[PDB]
Paper text:
Type 4 pili (T4P)—important in bacterial pathogens—are filaments composed of one well-characterized major pilin, and several minor pilins whose roles are often poorly understood. Streptococcus sanguinis T4P are composed of five pilins, which makes it a good model to determine the role of each pilin subunit in detail. PilE1/PilE2 are the major pilins forming the backbone of the filament, while the three minor pilins (PilA, PilB, and PilC) form a tip-located complex promoting adhesion to various host receptors. Here, we characterize PilA and PilC, showing how they interact and how they function.
Protein crystals for PilCSK36 were produced in 0.2 µL sitting drop with a 1:1 protein to mother liquor (0.2 M MgCl26H2O, 20% w/v PEG 3350). Data were collected at the Diamond beamline i04, and structure was produced using the PilC structure from strain 2908 for molecular replacement. After collecting a complete dataset, we solved a 1.60 Å resolution structure. Surprisingly, although the purified protein contained the pilin moiety, this portion was missing in the crystals. It must therefore have been degraded during prolonged incubation in the crystallization trays due to its inherent instability. When we compared our two PilC structures, we found that they are essentially identical, superposing onto each other with an rmsd of only 0.79 Å. This suggests that these proteins—showing 57% sequence identity —are likely to bind similar glycan ligands. We observed a similar binding profile for PilCSK36, showing that glycan-binding ability is conserved in PilC orthologs.
Numbering used by the authors: 83 to 156, 161 to 462
Write the structure that this text describes.
């Protein structure tokens, strides 16, 4: 297939980037390609052609159609990845940066190049060592308010020799993990906390995916001003779960917790040690089915000294909560709220916005979560 005179030293890479995920609305990096020994390739009269490729909406593997799943890794049993070129479409004819569109979310982009001899006989397109994943999370003007975002599928593991590789699909938690706030695209967003991640092959989809498994430990994010309005949107996996999935420590005296019970009930627990609110337990008007994935979103906003929290399960409102911020002589200053994930939970993805998402935005995220591993 390949002409005998194409040299073996073609070098293909992404220029000036160490980040291999991008959101819709961003522009990706330029590609770069060339023969290492240019004296040799000129003497053979070889030139190059290059192109960007976008992976298809599904992968054709083992005579079936598999849903694409993200990874930031560079095999045997494990993740199913698109093959170049059968699972890609060529989208450009050069190395110039690609403007990432909404229609590219949840796909791979890869840059490839080939040698061509002076008779016009082409070699095979060759990619560099690293593909780009286009984040599945819808943007549509939301990205200026995305403050935290972690997709468990993008977690990696750090080996003894400090190299970083994919987590093996062995169904057990690993704690030597590389997990980040991916919304942070300028500075280091890798979390310093211990975040156990499980990679496993999910039979429902004949494909791997990953789950954060905190096993009742907590991860804490501080200094969130809930007066701006705030929204936490989570996707949890299809296993039985219990405990404090999400806790808002609005104050040293005021906290509000989404607590899962094993029977699928969602308890809403309020603690206020001031006289501003009583506190106690309420139950959301829902029962989770832990044999499916479920999305849980909480949006909060302050209007006229009242903090309203609304809970959306799989897109549906199932609980509204009002908390007095100024009552009976107390004033709760919630400019430095804490957002805590925890419980014996299995978290596939979470996103935090420093605004109250509209009804439309809540539905957009609920549909993304519901279709993340579904046929597209």
């Amino acid at each position: 297939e390949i002409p005998l005179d194409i040299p073996e030293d073609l070098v293909v890479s992404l220029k000036d980037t160490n980040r291999y995920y991008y959101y819709a609305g961003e522009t990706g990096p330029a590609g770069q390609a060339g023969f290492k020994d240019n004296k040799q390739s000129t003497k053979a009269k070889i030139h190059t052609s290059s192109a960007w490729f976008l992976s298809e909406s599904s992968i054709n593997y083992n005579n079936s159609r598999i849903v694409p799943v993200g990874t930031l890794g560079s095999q045997g049993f494990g993740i199913v990845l698109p093959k170049l070129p059968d699972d890609f479409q060529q989208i450009s004819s050069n190395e110039k940066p690609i403007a990432i569109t909404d229609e590219m979310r949840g796909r791979y982009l890869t840059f490839a190049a080939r040698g061509i001899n002076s008779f016009g006989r082409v070699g095979k397109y060759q990619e560099g060592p690293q593909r780009i994943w286009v984040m599945g999370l819808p943007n549509r003007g939301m990205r200026s308010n995305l403050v935290l975002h972690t997709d468990a599928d993008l977690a990696l593991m750090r080996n003894s020799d400090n190299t970083i590789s994919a987590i093996p699909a062995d169904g057990v938690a690993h704690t030597n993990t590389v997990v980040a706030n991916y919304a942070e695209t300028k500075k280091n967003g890798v979390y310093g906390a211990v975040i156990p991640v499980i990679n496993y092959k999910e039979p429902a989809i004949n494909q791997t995916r990953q789950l954060i498994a905190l096993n009742d430990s907590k991860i804490q994010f501080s200094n969130h001003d809930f007066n701006k309005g705030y929204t936490t949107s989570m996707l949890i996996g299809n296993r039985q779960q219990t405990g404090s999935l999400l806790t808002y420590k609005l104050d040293n005296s005021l906290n509000w917790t989404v607590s899962l019970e094993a029977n699928g009930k969602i308890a809403i627990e309020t603690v206020d040690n001031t006289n501003a609110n009583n506190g106690g337990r309420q139950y959301a008007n829902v029962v989770l089915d832990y044999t499916k994935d479920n999305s849980i979103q909480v949006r909060a906003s302050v209007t006229n000294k009242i903090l309203t929290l609304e809970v959306f399960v799989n897109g549906a409102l199932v609980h509204t909560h009002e908390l007095f911020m100024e009552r009976n002589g107390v004033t709760h200053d919630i400019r430095k709220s804490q957002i805590i994930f925890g419980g014996k939970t299995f978290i596939n993805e979470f996103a935090v916005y420093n605004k109250k998402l509209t009804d439309s935005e809540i539905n957009i995220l609920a549909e993304y979560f519901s279709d993340k591993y579904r046929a597209k």
